[PDB]
Amino acid sequence: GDERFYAHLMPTLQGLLDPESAHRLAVRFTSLGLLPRARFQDSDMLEVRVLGHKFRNPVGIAAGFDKHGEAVDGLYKMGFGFVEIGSVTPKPQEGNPRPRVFRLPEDQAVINRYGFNSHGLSVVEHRLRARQQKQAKLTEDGLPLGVNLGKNKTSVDAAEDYAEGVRVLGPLADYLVVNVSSPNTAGLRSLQGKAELRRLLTKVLQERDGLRRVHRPAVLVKIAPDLTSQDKEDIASVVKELGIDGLIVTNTTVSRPAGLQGALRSETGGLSGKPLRDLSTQTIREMYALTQGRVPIIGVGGVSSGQDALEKIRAGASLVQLYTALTFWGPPVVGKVKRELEALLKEQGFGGVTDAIGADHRR
Template sequence: MREGRLLAAIARRFAYGSSSCIHTAAETSGSAKEAVAAAFQKPPLPPKIRLTWGRVLTGTLLGAVIAGGAYVGTRDEATISAWTFEAAKYINPLFRLLDPENAHKVAIWASSHCLCPRETRPDPPVLEVSVWGRTFSNPVGLAAGFDKNAEAVEGLLGIGFGFMEVGSVTPVPQEGNPKPRVFRLPEQGAIINRYGFNSEGIVAVAKRLGAQHGKRRMAETVNSAITTNTEQRVLGGKAGPGILGVNLGKNKTSEDAAADYVQGVHTLSQYADYLVINVSSPNTPGLRKLQGRKQLKDLIKKVLAARDEMQWGEEGPPPLLVKIAPDLSKQDLADIAAVALSLRLDGLIIANTTVSRPDSVIGLVHADEMGGLSGKPLFTLSTEVLREMYQLTWGKIPLVGCGGISSGEEAYVKIRAGATLVQLYTTFAYEGPALIPRIKAELAACLERDGFKSAQEAIGADHR
C-alpha cells in the first residue's frame, strides 16, 4: 500500500509538476500498478479558451513591459539613455512615410507626451558656454519653427538641447498660408516651407509657458529644501534644464508691426530666458522690409522700451535678439550691424530660411515651390553671412549661427566663424533625436582635436 502511494506521488509530480494537480483513485487502490496507471491518466481539459487579437496584443504588450522592466532594472540610467537614442534611429524613418506637415504634428505630439528619448548623461564640460549671464550646458539649440506653440518644451529640452526657441508667436491666432505648405527635398536634406506664421496666439502660448514656469519654480523650491550645498551651480533657465527663447512675430493683416511685437513682449517675456524679434520670414508679406536701417532702429527702440518698462528681479530683463535673413546685401548687413551696435542689441540670429535656390537643388522635385529653403544647401550662405556680421560688429555682439548644420564639424565651423551658439531644425526633422548626442560628441571631438579647453574659447577663432 505504501509503495503504491509513493509511486503514484512520484508519477504525478513527474507528469504535471505538482502532486496537487490531480486526484485519482490510486491512493486507495492498494496496488502500485494501478496507482501508476491512474497517475498517468490525462487530467480533465480546462474550458476552451478563445484567443482574440485583443488578448494576443495585450499579452504581447504585457510581455514587452515585463521584459523592458527587467532590462531597465539591470542597467544604469546612462546605458538606458544610450539605448533609447539608438532605438530612435530605427523609428524616425517611419515619419517620412507621412506628409511633411502631418509628420511634424506627430513629432510634436510625441514630444509633448514625453515619448521621445530622454538624455540623462551629462554634457562634456568642454561644451559649456556662458552668455547673457546664463550658462548653457552645450551650445546646440533647437531653432524656432519646430515647436511653434510651446506644446513640447519639456520633452524637447529633455532630448539634450542646450536651449530651444518656441514660436514664432503672433498676438492673434492665425491659420497661416493654405496647404500644402511644406515640401521635402530629401536628395539634399532640405525643406521648403511657406507656413506663414501659423500660430495659436500669445494667450495660448502664455498659458502653456506659465504652467511650465510654475513646475520649474516648484522643482527649484524642493531642490533648495533638500540640498545642503547652498552654493551648488544650477544649469538651465525658466523652463527647466535648458534655456528657453521666445520668438515673436506679427500678424499677417496687422498694420502696426511694432504694436504686435510690443504685445508679445508684455505677455511672454516673463517666461523667456531671451526674446527674439523675427523680421526675416519670407512668408509674411512686407516683413523683411523691417530689416531696413530706419525701420529696424525704430522697431527695436519700441520693443526695448516695452521690455524695460516692466518690473524685473535681480536677474534683469531677458536679452533681446533679432533674427535676420541670409539674402541681404552687404549694405543691408552693414546697416543692421550699425543699428545693433548703437542700440546695444543683445544678439543676432543668423540666419532664417532663404528665398534663393542654390545650384544643388535646381531641378529637384518641389524646388520651384514658393517659400523659404532650409537644410544643407543653406549652410554655406548662412555661414558666410555669419562670418561677415562678426567682422562688422567687431565680435562685440553674441551671434547665433543657424542654417544647414548637419554634423558636429559644421557646428564647429559656425562657432569658429563667430557663433556663440548654434541652432538646428531641418536635419533634426530628418534624423530625429539620435542627431543630438551625435552632434554634441562630434563637436566635443573637434574642440579637443584643436586644443580648445571649451567651446567658449573657439568662438570667432577664424578671425584671430
C-alpha cells in the same frame, strides 16, 4: 536611441506621412515624453555663458518646431541645451493653406511656407505660466528658454505687434527674438531696413526695459541669409547704436542655390537644411566682423554634425541651433552633434566651446 537605426526609422515614417503631419505627430510624441531620454551627458567643455545665462551645451532647437510652446520639456529631454519656441503672433491665426511644407530628400533640405500659424500670445502665455517655476529651475540649471515673436498677417502696426509680444511673453522668457526675417509674411523682411529697424527696435527695447528686473529678457534680432552687404552694414550699425543683446543668424533662404535636385525645389517658401548651411555660416562670419565680436550670435542653418556646429562657432557663433536635420536623422542627431563637437574641440586644441568662438577671425 541608435543614430544608425533612425537615419530605417526616419526614411520609413517620411514615406508614410506628409511633412506637416509628421511634424504635428513629432510635437505630440515629444510633448508626451515618448522618446528615450538622451544618454549623452554634457561635459563642462560644452558649457557657454552668454546673454546673461549659463547654457549647459551650445546646441538648441530652432524656432518653428515648437511654435506654440507645447513640447518644451520634451525638447530638454532630447538633449538640447536651450529651447526656442515661436514664432508667436499677437492674435491666433491659421497660416497658409496646405500643403505648405515640402521635403527635398535628395538635398537634405525642406521648403516651408507656413505663414506664422500661431495659437497666439494669450494661449502661449497661459501654457508657459503653467510651467513657469519649472522653467525657472531649468534656467538656473543651465537650460534657458527663448521666445520668438512674430506679427499678424493683417496687422496695421508691425512695431505694436512686437511690442505686445514683449509685454506678454517677455516676462516668461530668458531671451526674446524679434523675427524680422520670415520669407512667408508679405513686407516683413523690409523691417530689416535701417530706418524701419531702428524705429522698431527702439520701441521693442523700451518695452523690454519697462519690465521688472527679474522678468527682463535679453532681446535678439533674427535676420535672413539673403541680405545685401548694405543691409548687413546697416543692421550692424543699428544693433550697436541701440545696444541690442544679440543676433540670430539665419532664418531660411528665398534663394534656390544651383544644384538642388528635389522635385519640389521650385515650391514657394523658405529653404532650410544642407543647402543653406554655408550661406548661413558666411552671414555669421560677416556679422561677427561688423560687430567686432562684441555682439553674441546664435548660428542657425544646415547644422547636422559636430563639424557643422564648430564651423559656425569658429565663424563667430556663441551658440547654435538646428531644426531640419531632425526631420532627416531624428532625435539621435542631437547627441551626435554634441559628441562630435566635443571630439573636434579637443582635436583642434580648444579647452572648451568658449575658446573656439570667433577663432577663425584670429587666425
